[PDB]
Design a protein around this nucleic acid. Structure first.
Lengths: 94, 98, 80, 111, 98, 80, 110, 94
DNA sequence: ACAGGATGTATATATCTGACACGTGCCTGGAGACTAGGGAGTAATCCCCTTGGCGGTTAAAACGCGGGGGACAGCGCGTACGTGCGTTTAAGCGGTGCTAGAGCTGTCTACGACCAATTGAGCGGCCTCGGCACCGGGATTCTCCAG
DNA sequence: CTGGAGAATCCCGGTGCCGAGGCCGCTCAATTGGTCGTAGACAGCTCTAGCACCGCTTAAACGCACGTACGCGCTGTCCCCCGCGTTTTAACCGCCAAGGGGATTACTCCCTAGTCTCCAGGCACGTGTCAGATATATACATCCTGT
């Protein structure tokens, strides 16, 4: 056989975190999966282009942060940068 | 005397109906036949997953609805309430699709 | 298959216009809409069939369609 | 042989999205020959935040639709009602999402 | 009586003149000051290569010329020859800026 | 450095419209054009400054502007 | 004793550098492996596109009574050719100007 | 000083073989260099996505061919495919 | 519809002038040769799942018709904008100087790849119950004609 | 400016059914742990070019005056599209059946990475010199007033 892969469990965990008594259908779950894959690809591609422009061979949290504040608009970018920074600082301590 | 709504009010009612709704507004089988005809123009004896034709129909309906929104904007810009092929052509030209 | 663009009927185009918030529709709108839909469908299907031929496949999958769509800047959610 | 109990990297970052999976995808996606340790953490945090924003707005759209389950229509309403989310996903079409209900003022009855 | 051209004729001749040429139609110093003023809020004490300001001016002029072409098409659509702010608004709305 | 948008003069906007093939220009066009130019410049310069800051530089280079434009689907030829 | 070196561009009958294209493919991390024929195919495509646009731009320069291609000639070549215009419809040529065209409604009335 | 890279000599060779008595300005040469870089990046990125979609790790001449016929329109696509196929055949033949 | 008067714009020559194209010397990055190993091409199998057909139901499409309301042509007017001129302003050119920062350049250290063992997170499959779709019945609202 | 008939829509209450979510077993992918090589951070020096200033010329911006033609409002007329009822048709759903090919696995082979050495292709620099702006003078080409 085979074995697929999706963000379905993670999207469901985030949904139960933000709306504990709200469900989600398979079509909406697939749309969220496509959204996560799309934003992942956009951010990773912009970070790859940043690293290639700056003649760097590694993608760091700086490349991801710059890609996020390039692709995401306004308050969305600000809050995403804050979340990523706090997650990196929490991960470094642990 | 039979009841008759004035011209436009039924149009507004179905505007509200089809903007509230979310289903595909094109019959599935004719659209599938159109897709298969175009594909056979490209490659002979192709096969389509049902999800492939469904994705094509979703995309085509979204494109046509957006194009009609821009066309309605063009028609209103010309102090008209009727969309005309000139409105579609102007919308596509500004979008760059021409 | 032939003349299947006539399957995109006048009421279907009217419904699509109603979803676009169109109140009044000229008689010549339907043929124009069929033409523009044919052009859009031709582009997307050409790219999708190119993707299918690259995979040495004979079945056009939903992945081919969504890759073709996101190639045109018409990225579609709900099919992978 | 006293290996410590495995802690997933998402738990270390305090995230729900998978840091290890994102790290593997970054490595396998041919974005760079090297991927930093904090890059998957930052990317997973951003993805989780954006997912949380969309899901919160879509759950709100399901609330006033008195539905306890998110459907594509709710996601479309949430995304197109939010100016920033709509700007982020302007070129994206959502299957079975519909459109925002809006009618131009000139088309309404003139009274 | 002094010789005068009728309204719109020297306008047409300078349409031809400015479509025949390629030079930048905005004065360099005011545009450079505008660029530095816009950039000053994003980051202070910021510097610009001369080629950077030249590239910005080229891109801005190309964008404005394309927007004016679309605006002219919008004005002609409404059976007018005078472009109006509503025409720019319609062009930007169809293009995707709004 | 303030009010430098008025440096984009009415004759300059007129020349830009003439290159766009505009025969007649309303009087309110100039402020609207200044607004749209301000928005476009703000977007492009914001992206270019982000690229510059990521490089730890403090001079906006031509390549930063070109990358900023290419991100917005307005790629510019002639500067690298 | 090594044999005489032959550039892969010469071996493929190309002007564009097959070796440089191969190195750029292997360094732009498009994939972890790059085939032998991929750089030569890409160099052939790039050389053909360059030949097409330069042919059209040189024709424009001749029509402009000039023996040197300038950005204006490249712009005219790109915008007059509808396929080349479709390929480069999102790019702006610096110092290229625009195509000379006036809408017929704006032309003098009588 | 430093050492920069460009397609200037190759563009000039192609120009001379397509227009022997015709020169090119520095700005036009820079525009041609930017065009070659942009088309290279477009084709290579499309081939990268094609290889990633089919779970392949190598970009071959067929990935480049598919990318070319995905990116170039109409007669340009078929002419470029003809040129690439001819070059690959006469390269493998030697 | 035709003079002709005037302003503007392609032709036609000198005349410097930077920018281009070509020649040189390096030097670093492709090319020749060889090896190893893993990616992929090929073959076999199997089992989704796509296609094709049939029949009944009925929702939707096609057709026709009456009419009203919107598109469009024409007219009037008045104001905003084009044109031109005299005046003002600051852009542009060409210097000059200076110093901030881009651009190498060498050290080294910390960080990311890689390998092996391990285990638990996540996926495939099963099952079940309740959220939502459907249906039927008022309650309500909006429309439109007639006052 | 409402009254009331009529049609569409919304609220509500009771089946029911299927898919969303939870549980379980397995397995493979993330962890951990340890090592090694090198990417980049970091300090330092250089020298490019970006910034700032000054003065003069003059092109360009600007303010004003005038007239005209164009935008826009109003009116008529007319015909095209909308609302609606009837007839037709083919979409849709359910079911069946077959076999095409997606897709998974095993084997092997050949094609690409990686190395090492070597040399020549291309780049930085320098330098004549010639398209090509740039001033003239000129020969029409249109524009516009007038008749």
């Amino acid at each position: 056989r085979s074995r697929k892969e999706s963000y379905s469990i993670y999207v469901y965990k985030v949904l139960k975190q933000v709306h504990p008594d709200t469900g989600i259908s398979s079509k909406a779950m697939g749309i969220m999966n496509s959204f996560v894959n799309d934003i992942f690809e956009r951010i990773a591609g912009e970070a790859s282009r940043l690293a290639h422009y700056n003649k760097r061979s590694t993608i760091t949290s700086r490349e991801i942060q710059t890609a996020v504040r390039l692709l995401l608009p306004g308050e969305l970018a600000k809050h995403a940068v804050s979340e990523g920074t706090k997650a990196v600082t929490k991960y470094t301590s642990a | 005397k039979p009841h008759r709504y004035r011209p436009g009010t039924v149009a507004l009612r179905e505007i509200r109906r089809y903007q509230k709704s979310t289903e595909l507004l094109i019959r599935k089988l004719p659209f599938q036949r159109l897709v298969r005809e175009i594909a056979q123009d490209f490659k002979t004896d192709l096969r389509f997953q049902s999800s492939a034709v469904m994705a094509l129909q979703e995309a085509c309906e979204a494109y046509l609805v957006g194009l009609f929104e821009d066309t309605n904007l063009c028609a209103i810009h010309a102090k008209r309430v009727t969309i005309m092929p000139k409105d579609i052509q102007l919308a596509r030209r500004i979008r760059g699709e021409r | 298959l032939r003349d299947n663009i006539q399957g995109i009927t006048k009421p279907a185009i009217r419904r699509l216009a109603r979803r676009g918030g169109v109140k009044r529709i000229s008689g010549l709108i339907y043929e124009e809409t069929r033409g523009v839909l044919k052009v859009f469908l031709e582009n997307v299907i050409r790219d999708a069939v190119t993707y299918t031929e690259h995979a040495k496949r004979k079945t056009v999958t939903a992945m081919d369609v969504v890759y073709a769509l996101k190639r045109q800047g018409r990225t579609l959610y709900g099919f992978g | 042989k006293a290996r410590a109990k495995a802690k997933t990297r998402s738990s270390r970052a305090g995230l729900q999205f998978p840091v290890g999976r994102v790290h593997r995808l970054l490595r396998k996606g041919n974005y760079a020959e090297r991927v930093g340790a904090g890059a998957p953490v930052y990317l997973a945090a951003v993805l989780e935040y954006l997912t949380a924003e969309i899901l919160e707005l879509a759950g709100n759209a399901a609330r006033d639709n008195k539905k306890t389950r998110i459907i594509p229509r709710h996601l479309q309403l949430a995304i197109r009602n939010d100016e920033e989310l709509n700007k982020l996903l302007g070129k994206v079409t959502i299957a079975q999402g519909g459109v925002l209900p809006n009618i131009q003022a000139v088309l309404l009855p003139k009274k």
